[PDB]
């Protein structure tokens, strides 16, 4: 399935995922697109910060669902 990831600026990205995929996998897919390392990423859905270990199905994330991405940038 395809889900959307949205930044504070409103920038939107589409990702091909399965419900079984972990949050780490999603972040890794985001890095493939944007080059930001996973540990400098935070994913938010339904007002909650997603934990790297859990899966998308664990958070009721579905097709055409929109996740929010905020960064914790580091220098180096």
């Amino acid at each position: 399935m395809q889900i959307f990831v949205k930044t504070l600026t409103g920038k939107t990205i589409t990702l091909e995922v399965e419900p079984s995929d972990t949050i780490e996998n999603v972040k890794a897919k985001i890095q493939d697109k944007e080059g930001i390392p996973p540990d400098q990423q935070r994913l938010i859905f339904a007002g909650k910060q997603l934990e790297d270990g859990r899966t998308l199905s664990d958070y009721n994330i579905q097709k055409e669902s929109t996740l929010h991405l905020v960064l914790r940038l580091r220098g180096x």
Partner: protein
Amino acid sequence: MEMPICAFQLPDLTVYNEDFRSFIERDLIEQSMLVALEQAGRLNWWVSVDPTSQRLLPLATTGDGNCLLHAASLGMWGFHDRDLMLRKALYALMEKGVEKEALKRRWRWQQTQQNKESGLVYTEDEWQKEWNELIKLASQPGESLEEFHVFVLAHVLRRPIVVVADTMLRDSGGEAFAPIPFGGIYLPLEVPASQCHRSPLVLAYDQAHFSALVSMEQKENTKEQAVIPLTDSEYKLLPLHFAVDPGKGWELASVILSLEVKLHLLHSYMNVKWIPLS
């Protein structure tokens, strides 16, 4: 119209300063950072509007140390493990010491405001976990550092830090992607101003890299002092990082109050000079 600036200089070693300055003179510049920040209009925009200002250039990092710590530890030139020692002090300050509770409140308060932008609300356990990660990053040698670490570093040095940076990360399309948090002024606010150095450490940030900024006069050892603006290119006062400890109290009236407080804090910790725009 007026604009605030402040002088800065490289450290002066009490021994082997000539040798140190020779290494500075033979240092390479971080070309990618210079090009990116100048084109984005963040670096050296002042050269045109202020004839007596100097073009500032980012020094390339040397050795295995983290680029931020290496840039900040030039005063310890001659000691190989200077980056490692600076990291221990930064970690020690967060983990121990008198001001760690106030530092933590400042971090949490700013992060809390940031969280509101995403409808996110941390539990106490989440606050503890996020804080633990900041400690872990500071404890591990070679690891890159965050905005708050720069703030703590200002306290370790007991010196203001000024970071030149762009405001937004942008994508392959060139569209804005996400904010860059590093640009601005970092004051040692938990340290009494009487015990602080007033001349700032001046840095630039670009593409996950920190670099110390110097003029060509400083780099060639012809002149000690250079100048750095305390505003952006639109003459807005640079952001003041982690400026509020809620443990010390908190509140156009609101915005203007934040502006006057900033000016008073700059006056307390820095030697600001005001010059006309040419």
